[PDB]
Structures are given as C-alpha cells and as structure tokens.
Ligand binder design. Structure first.
Ligand SMILES: *[C@@H]1O[C@H](CO)[C@@H](O[C@@H]2O[C@H](CO)[C@@H](O[C@@H]3O[C@H](CO)[C@@H](O)[C@H](O[C@H]4O[C@H](CO)[C@@H](O)[C@H](O)[C@@H]4O[C@H]4O[C@H](CO)[C@@H](O)[C@H](O)[C@@H]4O[C@H]4O[C@H](CO)[C@@H](O)[C@H](O)[C@@H]4O)[C@@H]3O)[C@H](O)[C@H]2NC(C)=O)[C@H](O)[C@H]1NC(C)=O
Ligand SMILES: *[C@@H]1O[C@H](CO)[C@@H](O[C@@H]2O[C@H](CO)[C@@H](O)[C@H](O)[C@H]2NC(C)=O)[C@H](O)[C@H]1NC(C)=O
Ligand SMILES: *[C@@H]1O[C@H](CO)[C@@H](O)[C@H](O)[C@H]1NC(C)=O
Ligand SMILES: [Ca+2]
Lengths: 389, 221
C-alpha cells in the first residue's frame, strides 16, 4: 500500500482448512534446476504472496547437494520466488545472505533479516527496502538465531524475536522493535517461559502473538504476546494437555501453563497455533517421536485451560508421510471483514531418515481457513527416493 | 485397546511358502504402517521391514529382500508376511509390531509372535505317563507328582493340571528335542490332604496330531 499497515481486523472463524499452495519442488526437482533448501515460510506483500526459504546453494541433482544436512554454512542465502513454483535457479530472488532469517512487509517496503557467521561471532543485518540498513552483532556468542517465519508489522513497528545463547541451557532471548530497518527498542525475554526458539507470529487487533519452541525442557510451547504499540510483551506456556512440540511425551489429562511440560528435553521442531478462545486451532506432528504426519486440532481456550482436549480436527499430512517445520502467515492486505488464518508445513526429504541420497531438502504445503466445513485431503511431498539413485 | 493377534504357529518342510497373518485391532490401520521383526532363538531382534498400510508399498531390510514379501488385506486390517522357499534357517518367531511413525523407528504395541519350524520331521503324537512317587513325602506335608509327555512333533503341547485348577505348585519344564522328537515334564506339589484323596489329573493337548489326553496320577506304590 502507499501507507503503513495497522492490524485492525481480528481472525475469521476457522471451520476447516483449504489448500492455498503446494510447490512440488522435490518431485519436479528430479529433472529441473530446483534449489536445495530447508526452513521455508511464506509472506505477503500488499501486492503478492511468495514462498521464502533458506537456500543451500546447490541444485538437488547437482553434486554439491551432498551434505546439506548442515544447517549453517556460507553457501546459505534467504530466497523468495512465486507462490507455488519450485525454488528454481532461474527465478529465485536472493533476499540477503546468512543461515537464519525473518522477513515481512510493513505496508510500504519490506524488511528482511539474515544472520550469518561463525557460531561465536555471528551478525544480523537488517535489510529494509532491499538495502542494508542496520546490523546487530552476537551478544552471547553462541549461535545468534531468529524466527524462520515472517514478522508482523503495526504502524511501522515490527517486533522480531532473536535468541542467542544455548539451545541446551538458558539462552539469552530478546525482542527487538524495528521501524523502517532502524532499532526502536529491544527488551529481554520476560514471563514464565523458560527458553525461546523459532517463533511463529500472527497479528490481530493491534497485538502480535508468537507460538515458539522450548528446546531445553518444553514439550508444550511458549507463547509470547507482544504489544507493538507500547513495545511490551509477556510469555507463558500453553495450558492444554494437548502437547504440540516434537518429540514429546504422550498428552496428559491436565497440561501446564507456567512451566515446561516435562518429558522431552534438549529437542523440538518449529511450530505454530492460532490462539483465539473458542476458535483456537493448534497444529502438531502426529508422531510423538518423528516429524511425520501433520494435523490441525481445535482445542477451545487452549492457551488458558489446563484441561483442554480437542473438538474438531483435520489431517494435513498422513503419519505415513514426512513433515517438518510449520509456522503462521496471513494476507494482511486481503480484503475482508477479517483475517483469514494460514499456515505452512515444510515437508523434509532426505537425510537423515532417507539416507539413500546424500542431500536433505523439502517442499511446502500451505493452507488458509474457510468458514465452510470443507472435506479434507492429505498432501504428500510426493517424490520417490528411488529415482534419484 | 490396541491388539494384534497373529496366526497359529506352522510346520513347513524345507522349500514351501508360508503366509503369516497379523490381524490388527484397536487403532486405524491406514495411519500406521506395519513392522515385521525376526526373533531367531540364538540371536535376538531383527527389523525385517515396514509396509505403508496406506499406499501399500514396503521397505525390506537387506537380509530379506527376495524370499519375504509383505502385503496386507486392508479390508480386514490384516498385514501378512509370506516366506517363499523355506530354508530351515528361517526357524524363528516373526512378530508384527506397529510402526508408531513413518518407517517404523519405534515399534509401540507388538503382536504375539508366530513360530516357524522348518522341518522334514513327521508329526508324531505324544505318549503321556503319570509319574506317581514310590511314596516319599516331598518336604513338609507335600507330595509332588508329575506327568511326562514323551516323544511328539512338533512343539507345542498344552499341559494343564486338573483342568487349570492346579495352578500353584506347578513347574512345567521346557520341552527339549532329542533329535527327531520332543520330551516334556511338569511337577506339581500338593499337600498330603489333597492327594490321593482329591483326583489329580494331567490334561495334555497336542493339537498338531489332534490329541487330548487326561491321565489320573493314581497312587501306584
Ligand atoms: C470428509 O471430510 C471431513 C472434514 O475434514 C471429515 O470430518 C472430519 O474428520 C476428522 C477425522 O475423522 C475429524 O477429526 C477428529 O476430530 C475429533 C473430535 O471429535 C478429534 O478428537 C480427533 O483428534 C484426535 O484423534 C486423532 C486421530 O483420530 C489424533 O491423531 C489426534 O492427535 C487426536 O487424539 C490424540 O490427542 C487427544 C487429546 O489429548 C487424546 O484425547 C487422544 O487420546 C489422542 O492421543 C494420542 O495421539 C497423540 C498424537 O498421535 C499423542 O500425542 C498422544 O500422546 C496419544 O498417543 C480427530 O481430529 C474431524 O473432527 C471431522 N471434521 C468435521 C468438520 O466433520 C469426514 O470424516 C470426511 N468424510 C469422509 C466420508 O471421509
Ligand atoms: C558426498 O557424497 C559421496 C557420494 O557421492 C560420499 O561418499 C562416501 O563417503 C565415504 C566417506 O564419508 C566413503 O568412504 C564412501 O566410500 C563413499 N561411498 C559412497 C557409496 O557414497 C561422501 O562422503 C559425501 N559427503 C561429503 C561431505 O562429500
Ligand atoms: C495506525 O495506528 C496508530 C496507533 O497505533 C494511529 O495513530 C495511526 O494514525 C494509524 N494509521 C492508520 C492508517 O490507521
Ligand atoms: Ca522440547
């Protein structure tokens, strides 16, 4: 738009989910110059929506594809390309260089943030309107990381959640507030949340909600609500017995809102949730131990209730298929009375579980919500690891 | 809750083909593939493979691609494993177990095990004997009397004392193959008041032959 954006509306009634995008990248990738990527997400300009992902700088067939299990390297690049196309060498747009990133449009231009580095000397540069504007350096010197979803903006202020520190210990999280690439304020994590990683954020009614990952002790996600108007936040865990991190212990009958729910430690997988009272939907992998299957379950008042069990569901990826990271996105410039709620699921293929190939990679599925109660299908990446041999 | 019953154990002579059935219950077949495992006697556990109960397509282990073939009758939620050209080295108890996740990295809920004896030996019924003592009070006011199930093929035999009622005091020793056939024995210890006054009996079933035997251990001394 020619003007900043204010999150004036609220969510619409989630009643089922409809397919929004499917890139089919590994399937096509067996014969085109599709790029090896991982950690995808989706973000909308006022004018178009694109798929964003962290490239590994090689084609899946190319011989340099071997060994892409490694998360960070200096051949990683944050790219974007059209909605539902593959990340193709000949049409991805490189957004900045690094191995962690967030990106989001404030209404006028967009901010992209790519962290790069040695694990003890990492540095973020905050690009705004395709130009490098600001740069922040490592405060705790052990892997500076950020979202791997899109950030939400309000009146020019876009809060962004950064964690430097240990993924096995206390880390040192901090909410930063950008307006037009400059740092308005930054404040330390606060609330009962014990450790924050890979936050998934959606905005409604001038408040932004993030649903993250506690790597350390959590099997129940930390929720951070941020107030972009006053530049304040708080964190807590989701009260529901319906545990959504992966791995996890099997769901209790009573859950935990002010501490990690004890069971699977030093591990997790990025995720999201739409937190809205009666209209709360949580996403989770089906396997208690592996990223296979993805489902969306309606768990009313999940955030606040230590007894909330589901009341409606939908299957996105079967348990016999692989899934991965997921996060929230919305089209803030979509004409409506309300905000359509969307999510994406990353579909990992390769190493370590399909180690007959030496590359890891992924495709994407994304859904948005419908108020109709539509029928469900289940959406496989689709490639046969045997044709790459 | 989740139950997986497997077929009854089979006797096949070297070279035949055998389809073991695993009829699954309690969960939704379509969302959880099947694992097949091999419990050899002297070796421990072997993952044989997994079958996508949704798409139908199987991943075999290396030690098994070629005589083993997984398949399923989804209609009855049954997953079946078949072994073609039975080499006697397939003597084991194959398990079906549920793949908690895609590919089976966690088998939560296993099935009962189906035993396979690949032998050329003939099915032979047992000959049962009541082993009364030459009196001999076996420790304080207890008499121990036995029943010997001798020379049959194949395993198993179902020995029970007194139609199940004599459950304490019993030790049924493992059956042992003396080259071509099996010998079995159990003892039971009862108080002197109980015997020869109540009627102690050995009931032995060898279902391979279709044999049901009932021996009174009547006092012969
Ligand atoms: C046409 O399409 C429509 C629209 O989609 C179809 O209707 C939909 O059909 C869905 C599936 O039939 C149905 O979803 C179900 O909704 C119920 C609410 O009534 C919900 O409980 C179900 O969710 C649980 O069950 C699934 C598997 O069934 C689990 O994977 C899921 O995780 C939920 O259960 C787990 O957590 C619960 C909460 O704590 C526990 O109580 C439960 O014991 C279970 O625990 C285990 O699983 C966890 C994950 O594996 C694990 O962590 C835990 O530790 C335990 O091990 C399910 O979503 C939709 O409600 C329905 N929607 C509509 C609008 O109708 C329709 O059928 C289609 N028609 C045809 C003809 O095909
Ligand atoms: C790159 O891919 C090759 C195969 O294209 C990998 O080669 C294997 O590497 C090991 C050592 O790790 C050798 O001993 C094996 O004999 C190789 N054989 C096979 C069949 O792959 C290589 O390791 C991969 N990794 C990297 C980082 O180059
Ligand atoms: C956006 O919101 C702020 C308060 O958060 C308000 O002062 C500003 O004028 C709003 N602009 C528009 C176009 O809504
Ligand atoms: Ca965890």
């Amino acid at each position: 738009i020619r003007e900043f954006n204010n999150l004036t509306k609220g969510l619409c009634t989630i009643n089922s989910w409809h397919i929004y995008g499917k890139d089919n990248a590994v399937r096509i990738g067996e014969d085109s110059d599709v790029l090896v990527t991982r950690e995808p997400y989706v973000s909308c300009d006022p004018d178009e929506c694109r798929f964003y992902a962290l490239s590994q700088g090689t084609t899946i067939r190319g011989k340099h594809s071997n060994g892409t299990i490694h998360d960070r390297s200096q051949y990683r690049d944050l790219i974007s390309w059209p909605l539902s196309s593959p990340p193709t060498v000949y049409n991805s747009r490189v957004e900045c260089i690094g191995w962690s990133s967030t990106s989001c449009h404030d209404g006028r231009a967009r901010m992209s943030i790519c962290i790069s580095g040695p694990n003890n000397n990492a540095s973020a540069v905050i690009w705004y309107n395709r130009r490098p504007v600001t740069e922040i350096n490592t405060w705790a010197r052990n892997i500076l990381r950020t979202q791997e979803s899109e950030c939400v903006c309000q009146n020019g202020v876009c809060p962004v959640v950064f964690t430097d520190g240990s993924a096995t210990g206390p880390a040192e999280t901090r909410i930063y507030y950008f307006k037009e690439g400059k740092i308005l304020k930054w404040e330390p994590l606060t609330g009962t949340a014990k450790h924050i990683e890979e936050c998934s954020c959606y905005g409604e009614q001038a408040g932004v909600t993030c649903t993250c990952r506690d790597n350390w002790q959590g099997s129940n996600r930390p929720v951070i609500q941020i107030d972009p108007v006053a530049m304040t936040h708080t964190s807590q865990y989701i009260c529901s017995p319906v545990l959504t991190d992966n791995p996890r212990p099997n769901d209790p009958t009573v859950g935990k809102c002010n501490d990690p729910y004890p069971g699977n430690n030093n591990n997790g997988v990025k995720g999201f949730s739409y937190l809205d009272g009666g209209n709360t939907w949580l996403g989770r992998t089906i396997s208690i131990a592996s990223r296979s299957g993805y489902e969306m379950l309606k768990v009313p008042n999940a955030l606040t209730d230590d007894r909330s069990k589901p009341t409606q569901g939908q299957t996105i990826v079967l348990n016999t298929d692989w899934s991965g990271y997921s996060g929230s996105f919305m089209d803030y410039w979509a004409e409506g009375e309300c905000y359509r709620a969307c999510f994406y699921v990353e579909l990992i293929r390769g190493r370590p579980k399909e180690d007959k190939v030496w590359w890891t990679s992924n495709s994407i599925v994304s859904m948005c919500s419908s108020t109709e109660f539509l029928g469900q299908w289940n959406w496989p990446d689709g490639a046969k690891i045997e044709y790459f041999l | 809750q989740i139950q997986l019953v497997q077929s009854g154990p089979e006797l096949k002579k070297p070279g035949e083909t055998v389809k073991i059935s695993c009829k699954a219950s309690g969960y939704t077949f379509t969302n959880y593939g099947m694992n097949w495992v091999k419990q050899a006697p002297g070796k421990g556990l072997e993952w044989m493979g997994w079958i996508n109960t949704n798409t139908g397509e199987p991943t075999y282990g290396e030690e098994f691609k070629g005589r083993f073939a997984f398949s399923l009758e989804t209609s009855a939620s049954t997953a079946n494993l078949q072994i073609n050209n039975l080499k006697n080295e397939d003597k084991a108890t194959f398990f079906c177990a549920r793949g908690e996740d895609n590919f089976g990295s966690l088998s939560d809920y296993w099935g009962q095990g189906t035993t396979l004896t690949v032998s050329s030996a003939k099915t032979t019924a047992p000959s049962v004997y009541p082993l009364a003592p030459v009196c001999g009070d076996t420790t304080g006011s207890s008499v121990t009397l036995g029943c010997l199930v001798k020379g049959y093929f194949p395993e198993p035999v179902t020995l029970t004392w007194n139609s199940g009622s004599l459950s304490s005091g019993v030790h049924t020793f493992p059956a042992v193959l003396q080259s071509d056939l099996y010998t079995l024995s159990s003892s039971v210890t009862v108080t002197s008041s109980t015997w020869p006054s109540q009627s102690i009996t050995c009931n032995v079933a060898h279902p391979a032959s279709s044999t049901k035997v009932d021996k009174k251990i009547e006092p012969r001394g």
